[PDB]
Nucleic acid binder design. Structure first.
Ligand SMILES: Cc1cn([C@H]2C[C@H](O)[C@@H](COP(=O)(O)OP(=O)(O)OP(=O)(O)O)O2)c(=O)[nH]c1=O
Ligand SMILES: [Ca+2]
Ligand SMILES: [Ca+2]
Ligand SMILES: [Ca+2]
Length: 439
DNA sequence: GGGGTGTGGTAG
DNA sequence: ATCGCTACCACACCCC
């Protein structure tokens, strides 16, 4: 039942098991579905519209669904009392999702099982459930079907398998109130709970995208929060960590902590920062984004999804990344893998009826001082990254052209096959295919 | 002013 | 064991 990377079935088996592959494939499908359902519609927010954002997201999605769908081997498992994770393995295996019991011990999505087990007091046992990928998708379908059926939103924007941004336009003749917004939140939560046979969503409700995201975090688990710009307070900002802000990850977090004397909440940050010191710390565009976010306001870039969702959701690149299980003995096997990847990508490219004029090969190579077999079974371990791109000239979907150039790109980066630990193949620029192809 | 490249980072 | 994907914005540093 084990498929090595030189086996023709490797890509199929890896993608079938990989949560992150599913995460990307689901999002791509939701994007395509939105564009197809709106090819002739012109559903979009205009400058004349005043809107409310309902940002809706499943609580511990994989853990909830895997629990509801668990096999009889786990019948006695208790979602409200047991710490529950979803993962493949037993040690250096990622926790895809953990329930809020597990989180009360400090366990987080993305931790290794080995790390999470150590956070449990003696006598407390971690419950590890398998993935149920098809049921994740079915629950998502129920989610999106329910959102449409409620007929309360002018625009429903897919964010992910378990998350959507739902926009309600308020006519100027209508007096919106907290009570009406609360009743809509409760309707949404109950209808999704029924429609999904027991999954919970939380909801952030506001007059900006960024505040609706923060409200969502405040609402979790299994709740809703309504915080409009009018309602902003010190109590609100004091409730969030710095990387609760959209666009702030670990690297930006570290830079903000170094620049502003280790702020411990968004309130700390907003009382200490200056716009200029903030652009200097994290960059001009991200600095302006954060500055606006601390006023509860969206930046120009984030607003594009409301005003032109078709262009924001339109796919502009196509790629695969395989950075697990990569163990090749020679260049012949590397070349065959590149060919299989190009075949896979060209199927995707032909499905969307496009050609490509620029491609990229990226690789991960074992660091010179890193063990040949890393801590994580079949992991890439510590690696150096290399990337090179090539303009094709004539846009094409021809395997011969693209695969030959990808294999040449690999040659130019000089990685010995045995040192290779990861490969990415990218079609960076896509070109339409029209009815007129006479030259 | 226009173009290019590889790399960093974040989102889900 | 264990499945560490993928799209896209932003940036620094080059060309004219
Ligand atoms: C962010 C992320 C999510 N996922 C999957 C598992 C998650 O259950 C699902 C949705 O992601 P999230 O919404 O980020 O997480 P969650 O729903 O488990 O927990 P929360 O209550 O805090 O929202 O997507 C991954 O597999 N890898 C990831 O990096
Ligand atoms: Ca979620
Ligand atoms: Ca989500
Ligand atoms: Ca963030």
């Amino acid at each position: 039942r084990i498929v090595a990377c030189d086996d023709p079935d490797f890509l199929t088996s890896y993608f079938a098991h990989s949560r992150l592959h599913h995460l990307s494939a689901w999002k791509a499908n939701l994007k395509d579905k939105f564009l197809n359902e709106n090819i002739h519609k012109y559903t979009k927010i205009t400058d004349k519209d005043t809107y409310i954002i309902f940002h809706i997201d499943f609580d511990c999605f994989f853990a909830t669904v895997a629990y509801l769908c668990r096999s009889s081997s786990f019948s006695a498992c208790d979602f409200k009392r047991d710490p529950i994770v979803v993962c493949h393995g037993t040690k250096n295996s990622d926790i895809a999702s953990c329930n809020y019991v597990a989180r009360s011990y400090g366990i987080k999505n993305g931790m290794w099982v080995s790390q999470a087990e150590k956070m449990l007091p003696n006598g407390i046992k971690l419950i590890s459930l398998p993935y149920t990928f098809e049921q994740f998708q079915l629950k998502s379908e129920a989610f999106y079907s329910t959102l449409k059926r409620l007929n309360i939103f002018n625009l429903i924007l897919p964010i992910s398998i378990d998350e959507a941004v739902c926009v309600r336009i308020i006519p100027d003749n209508i007096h919106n109130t907290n009570t009406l917004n609360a009743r809509l939140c409760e309707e949404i939560r109950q209808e999704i709970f029924q429609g999904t046979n027991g999954c919970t969503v939380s909801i952030g409700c506001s007059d900006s995208l960024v505040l609706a995201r923060l409200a969502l975090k405040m609402a979790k688990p299994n709740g809703y929060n309504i915080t409009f710009k009018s309602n902003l307070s010190e109590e609100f900002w004091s409730s969030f960590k710095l990387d609760d802000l959209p666009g702030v990850g670990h690297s930006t977090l570290s830079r903000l902590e170094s620049t502003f004397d280790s702020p411990h909440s968004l309130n700390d940050l907003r009382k200490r920062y200056t716009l200029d010191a903030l652009k200097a710390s994290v960059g001009s565009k991200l600095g302006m984004k954060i500055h606006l976010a601390l006023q509860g306001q969206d930046d120009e870039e984030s607003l594009k999804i409301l005003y032109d969702p078709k262009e924001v959701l339109q796919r502009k690149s196509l790629s695969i990344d395989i950075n697990w299980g990569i163990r090749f003995k020679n260049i012949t096997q590397v070349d065959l893998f590149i060919e299989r990847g190009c075949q896979y990508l060209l199927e995707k490219l032909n499905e969307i009826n496009k050609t490509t004029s620029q491609i990229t090969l990226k690789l991960m190579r074992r660091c010179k001082d890193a063990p040949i077999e890393p801590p994580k079974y079949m992991g890439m371990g510590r690696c150096d990254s290399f990337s090179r791109s090539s303009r094709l000239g004539i846009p094409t979907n021809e395997f011969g052209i693209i695969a030959t150039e990808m294999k040449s790109l690999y040659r130019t980066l000089g990685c010995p096959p045995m040192e290779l630990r990861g490969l990415a193949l990218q079609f960076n620029k896509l070109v339409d295919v029209g009815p007129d192809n006479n030259q």
